[PDB]
Design a protein around this ligand. Structure first.
Ligand SMILES: COC[C@@H]1CCCN(CCNC(=O)c2cc3nn(CC4CCCCC4)cc3cc2Oc2ccc(F)cc2F)C1
Ligand SMILES: *[C@@H]1O[C@H](CO[C@@H]2O[C@@H](C)[C@@H](O)[C@@H](O)[C@@H]2O)[C@@H](O[C@@H]2O[C@H](CO)[C@@H](O)[C@H](O)[C@H]2NC(C)=O)[C@H](O)[C@H]1NC(C)=O
Ligand SMILES: *[C@@H]1O[C@H](CO[C@@H]2O[C@@H](C)[C@@H](O)[C@@H](O)[C@@H]2O)[C@@H](O[C@@H]2O[C@H](CO)[C@@H](O)[C@H](O)[C@H]2NC(C)=O)[C@H](O)[C@H]1NC(C)=O
Ligand SMILES: *[C@@H]1O[C@H](CO[C@@H]2O[C@@H](C)[C@@H](O)[C@@H](O)[C@@H]2O)[C@@H](O)[C@H](O)[C@H]1NC(C)=O
Ligand SMILES: *[C@@H]1O[C@H](CO)[C@@H](O)[C@H](O)[C@H]1NC(C)=O
Ligand SMILES: *[C@@H]1O[C@H](CO)[C@@H](O)[C@H](O)[C@H]1NC(C)=O
Ligand SMILES: *[C@@H]1O[C@H](CO)[C@@H](O)[C@H](O)[C@H]1NC(C)=O
Ligand SMILES: [Cl-]
Ligand SMILES: [Cl-]
Ligand SMILES: [Cl-]
Length: 527
C-alpha cells in the first residue's frame, strides 16, 4: 500500500508491473477547484485541502470537447478521442514514479495537443509508466480546459479573460513545484514536453513570466506558438466571443452580463455552437485558442521571440516528415483515407482555398507557383504530395524551424530533429507517410513492449529516442553515449544542423526545407 502526503491531503496510488519491474501510478490527482458554476470561464482557483485519503487509482474525467466523428469505428482516428467521461470537472493530473521510490528524480511533464479544442492526458499513447520504469524519471501529465471553456476571451474582463487552459497548465506546474519532492522528484529538474497544441503551449510557457520559475528545460514536438494557428488576435477573439453569444441567444450590452448568461448554458450548447463562431475557417479551425491577454502573455509573442524576451534554457525541437497529410482528409476535395487520393490541378487549387480561406487570389497563386514546378510533370501523385507539403510546411515545419533559429540566437543550446519513420502498425494509408502525431508513441516507449507487434528495429529506435529525451531532461544534452550513436549537434542559425530519426542510419543534415521556408517565412506573411 503506497500513500503519499501532499500539501493538500493524502493520496493513494497503485502498483503496475512493467518489464518485470514495478511502477507506482497516481492517476487522477485534482489540482484545482473544479471550474463549475460561477467559476466557468475564470482562471483556475486553488485547491481546498482534504483530510481523507484520495484514491488516485483511475484516470479522471476529460474536459468537455467536441469529438472527431469523421471515421466511426476506425482506430486511426478513434484512438485520439477521449477515453474517460467528459465533464467540466476535469482539472486533474497523473504521476508515474519509479519503484523503488527515487531519491531526487528528474521530472517530465506532458502537455497533450489537439488544436486547443480537444485532447486528454489519459490516452494510452501518453501512458507514462514505460518512461518511469526504463529511465527512472518521474512523468506527470495534466488535463486542461480546451475550446471555448478554456480560451473564450473578453480581453481585460476577468470573468472571461482568455488563456484559462494555459493557466490550468500553469497551476499544474506549480503543483509539481510544491508536491513532487514528496514523490521523490526534483523540483529543480523539470522538463516540459508536448506535441502540436501541446508543443505550442510549452513554447508559450517559455515566454510567460509566471512560468519562468516552474520548469527547467523544454521539448517541442511538431508545434510552436508562431505557427499560424496557435494565437488568436484580440480582434478575432472578440468577434468569436460575440458570435458565440449571438448563436446561444446570450448577446447583451454589458459584457459581464454576457458571461453571466453564458454561465447558465449547458456545455453541449456551448460545444455545438463553437464550430460556427468563425465565418470561413480552415478544417479543424482553432476557434478558441491562446490570446494576448496581458496576464499569461504580456505582448504579441512574435515580438517577445524577436527581442529575446523569454526563458534562457535549452530546447529540443522537432517535426515529422509528413506533418500535413493527416489534415487533407478533413476537407480537401479529392482526398480519402480509403484510396491513393490522386488529385488534379483543379483539385489542388480547390484545396488551397480550403486551407487558405482568407487569403487573396494572388497569395494562393504564389503557393501554387512555388510548389508546382515539377521534377516530372507526368508523375500522377504530384498534386497530392504538393498539397500535403504545403499544409505541413506552412503550419508546422517552417514555424518550428523559425522558432529554433530565433531562440538560439540568444545563446542557448537548441537541438532539432526530423522524425522520418512510419510506424509498421500504422492504420492510415501509405500515401500519408510519416504522420503528424505518430512519433509520440516512440517517445513514450510503446515499441519497447515486445507484445505490441512492433518490429525489432522500432524497439531499438524507441529505446534510443527514450534515452536521448531522458538525457536531455536530466542533463540538457540529447545524446546516447553508450551505443556508438551519432552525436546530436547543437542547432545554430548559421549552420542549422539537425538530426534525423529513423530505424536505419541516423544522419546529420543542414537547412531543412530551406527553399520552402524562405517562401513561407519571408514572402508569404506580406500577402
Ligand atoms: C490530425 O487529424 C488526424 C489525427 C491523426 C494524428 C493526430 N490527431 C490526434 C491529435 N490531434 C491533432 O493532432 C490536431 C491538430 C490540429 N492542428 N490544427 C490547426 C491547423 C488546422 C488546419 C491544418 C493545419 C493545422 C487543428 C488541430 C486539431 C487536432 O485535433 C483534432 C480535433 C478534432 C478532430 F475532429 C480531429 C483532430 F485531429 C488525429
Ligand atoms: C465577425 O463576425 C460576423 C458575424 O457573422 C457570423 O456568421 C455566422 C456564420 C455565425 O457565426 C454568426 O454567429 C455570426 O453572425 C461576420 O459577419 C459575416 O461576414 C461574412 C464575410 O466576412 C459575410 O458573408 C456574412 O454575411 C456575415 N454575416 C453576418 C450575419 O453579418 C464578420 O465578417 C466577422 N468579422 C470578420 C472580420 O471576419
Ligand atoms: C477517392 O475517394 C474520394 C472520396 O469518395 C468517397 O470515398 C471512396 C473511397 C468511395 O467510397 C466513394 O464512393 C466515396 O464518394 C473520391 O472523391 C469523390 O469523387 C466523387 C465522384 O467522382 C465526387 O462527386 C465527390 O465530390 C468526391 N468526394 C470528395 C470528398 O472529394 C475520389 O474521387 C477518389 N479518388 C480516387 C483516385 O480513387
Ligand atoms: C536535489 O538536487 C538539487 C539540485 O538539482 C540539480 O541542480 C538543478 C539546478 C538542475 O540542473 C538539476 O537538473 C540538477 O539535478 C539539490 O539542490 C537538492 O537539495 C537535492 N535534494 C535532495 C537530494 O533531496
Ligand atoms: C480507497 O480504497 C480502499 C480499498 O482499497 C477503501 O478502503 C477506501 O474506502 C477507498 N476510498 C474511497 C472509495 O474513497
Ligand atoms: C455590468 O454589470 C456588472 C455586474 O453587475 C457591474 O458590476 C458593472 O458595473 C456593469 N457595467 C456597466 C457598464 O453597465
Ligand atoms: C544499446 O545496445 C544494446 C545492445 O547492444 C541494447 O539492448 C540497448 O537497449 C541499447 N541502449 C540504448 C540506450 O539505445
Ligand atoms: Cl458534459
Ligand atoms: Cl501539370
Ligand atoms: Cl539557408
Amino acid at each position: 500500500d503506497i500513500i503519499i502526503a501532499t500539501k493538500n491531503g493524502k493520496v493513494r496510488g497503485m502498483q503496475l508491473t512493467v518489464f518485470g519491474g514495478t511502477v507506482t501510478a497516481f492517476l487522477g490527482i485534482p489540482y484545482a477547484q473544479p471550474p463549475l458554476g460561477r467559476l466557468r470561464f475564470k482562471k483556475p482557483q486553488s485547491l481546498t485541502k482534504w483530510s481523507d485519503i484520495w484514491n488516485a487509482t483511475k484516470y479522471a474525467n476529460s474536459c468537455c470537447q467536441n469529438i472527431d466523428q469523421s471515421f466511426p469505428g476506425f482506430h486511426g482516428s478513434e484512438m485520439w478521442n477521449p477515453n474517460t467521461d467528459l465533464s467540466e470537472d476535469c482539472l486533474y493530473l497523473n504521476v508515474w514514479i519509479p519503484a523503488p521510490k527515487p531519491k531526487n528524480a528528474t521530472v517530465l511533464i506532458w502537455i497533450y495537443g489537439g488544436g486547443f479544442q480537444t485532447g486528454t492526458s489519459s490516452l494510452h499513447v501518453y501512458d507514462g509508466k514505460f518512461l518511469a520504469r526504463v529511465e527512472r524519471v518521474i512523468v506527470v501529465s495534466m488535463n486542461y480546459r480546451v475550446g471555448a471553456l478554456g480560451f473564450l476571451a473578453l480581453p481585460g474582463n476577468p470573468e472571461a479573460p482568455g488563456n484559462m487552459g494555459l493557466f490550468d497548465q500553469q497551476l499544474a506546474l506549480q503543483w509539481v513545484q510544491k508536491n513532487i519532492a514528496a514523490f521523490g522528484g526534483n523540483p529543480k529538474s523539470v522538463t516540459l514536453f508536448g506535441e502540436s497544441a501541446g508543443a505550442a503551449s510549452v513554447s508559450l510557457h517559455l515566454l510567460s513570466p509566471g512560468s519562468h520559475s516552474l520548469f527547467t528545460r523544454a521539448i517541442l514536438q511538431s508545434g510552436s506558438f508562431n505557427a499560424p494557428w496557435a494565437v488568436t488576435s484580440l480582434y478575432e477573439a472578440r468577434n468569436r466571443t460575440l458570435n458565440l453569444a449571438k448563436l446561444t441567444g446570450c448577446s447583451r450590452e454589458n459584457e459581464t452580463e454576457i458571461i453571466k448568461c453564458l454561465r447558465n448554458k449547458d456545455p453541449q450548447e456551448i460545444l455545438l455552437n463553437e464550430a460556427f463562431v468563425v465565418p470561413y475557417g480552415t478544417p479543424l479551425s482553432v476557434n478558441f485558442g491562446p490570446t494576448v491577454d496581458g496576464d499569461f502573455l504580456t505582448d504579441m509573442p512574435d515580438i517577445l521571440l524577436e527581442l529575446g524576451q523569454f526563458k534562457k534554457t535549452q530546447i529540443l525541437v522537432g517535426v515529422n516528415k509528413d506533418e500535413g497529410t493527416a489534415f487533407l482528409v478533413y476537407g480537401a476535395p479529392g482526398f480519402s483515407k480509403d484510396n491513393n487520393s490522386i488529385i488534379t490541378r483543379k483539385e489542388f487549387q480547390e484545396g488551397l482555398k480550403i486551407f487558405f480561406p482568407g487569403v487573396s487570389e494572388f497569395g494562393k497563386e504564389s503557393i501554387l507557383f512555388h510548389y508546382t514546378d515539377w521534377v516530372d510533370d507526368q508523375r500522377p501523385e504530384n498534386y497530392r504530395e504538393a498539397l500535403g507539403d504545403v499544409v505541413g510546411d506552412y503550419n508546422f515545419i517552417c514555424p518550428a524551424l523559425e522558432f529554433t533559429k530565433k531562440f538560439s540566437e540568444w545563446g542557448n543550446n537548441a537541438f532539432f530533429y526530423y522524425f522520418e519513420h512510419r510506424s509498421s502498425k500504422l492504420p492510415w494509408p501509405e500515401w500519408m507517410g510519416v504522420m503528424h502525431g505518430y512519433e509520440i508513441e516512440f517517445v513514450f516507449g510503446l515499441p519497447l513492449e515486445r507484445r505490441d507487434q512492433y518490429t525489432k528495429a522500432e524497439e531499438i529506435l524507441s529505446r534510443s529516442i527514450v534515452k536521448r529525451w531522458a538525457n536531455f531532461a536530466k542533463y540538457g544534452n540529447p545524446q546516447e553515449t553508450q551505443n556508438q550513436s551519432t552525436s546530436w549537434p547543437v542547432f545554430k542559425s548559421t549552420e542549422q544542423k539537425y538530426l534525423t530519426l529513423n530505424t536505419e542510419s541516423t544522419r546529420i543534415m543542414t537547412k531543412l526545407r530551406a527553399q520552402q521556408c524562405r517562401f513561407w517565412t519571408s514572402f508569404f506573411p506580406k500577402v
